[PDB]
Design a protein around this ligand. Structure first.
Ligand SMILES: *[C@@H]1O[C@H](CO)[C@@H](O[C@@H]2O[C@H](CO)[C@@H](O)[C@H](O)[C@H]2NC(C)=O)[C@H](O)[C@H]1NC(C)=O
Ligand SMILES: *[C@@H]1O[C@H](CO)[C@@H](O)[C@H](O)[C@H]1NC(C)=O
Lengths: 49, 49
């Protein structure tokens, strides 16, 4: 109840913090992925809204 | 606008056949016997779900 610790010196610290900000922008060709070069497949895919 | 567009898209999804003969349940029931009609109704149910 009557003792205190006081610093008599200091230190300058440089720390590193890494934060993600953005990610990969991707695009998908639905017809090419599902029905790549196929007219019958494309016509059937039109049925799915 | 996003919420309204989501609801409108959900409504417009009801016109899709999803591979069935028709997108209308009443037409499927009227044009087919129960056992065959069950298959088309299953396709519509899966699509709408
Ligand atoms: C406070 O700490 C610094 C280091 O963090 C001390 O500086 C060092 O002092 C010694 C002896 O004088 C030298 O040999 C080192 O080269 C010094 N280091 C640097 C980076 O300068 C400083 O003396 C301390 N101060 C007190 C009052 O203790
Ligand atoms: C202060 O601390 C001492 C021991 O560190 C303790 O015996 C004493 O009771 C404390 N003071 C009070 C008023 O209690």
């Amino acid at each position: 109840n009557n003792s205190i610790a006081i610093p008599t010196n200091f230190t300058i610290s440089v720390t590193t913090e890494i934060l993600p900000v953005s990610m990969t922008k991707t695009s998908v060709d639905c017809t090419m992925y599902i029905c790549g070069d196929s007219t019958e497949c494309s016509n059937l895919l039109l049925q799915y809204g | 606008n996003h919420n309204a567009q989501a609801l409108n898209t959900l409504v417009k999804q009801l016109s899709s056949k999803f591979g069935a003969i028709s997108s209308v349940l009443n037409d499927i029931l009227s044009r087919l016997d129960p056992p065959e009609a069950e298959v088309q109704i299953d396709r519509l149910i899966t699509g709408r779900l």
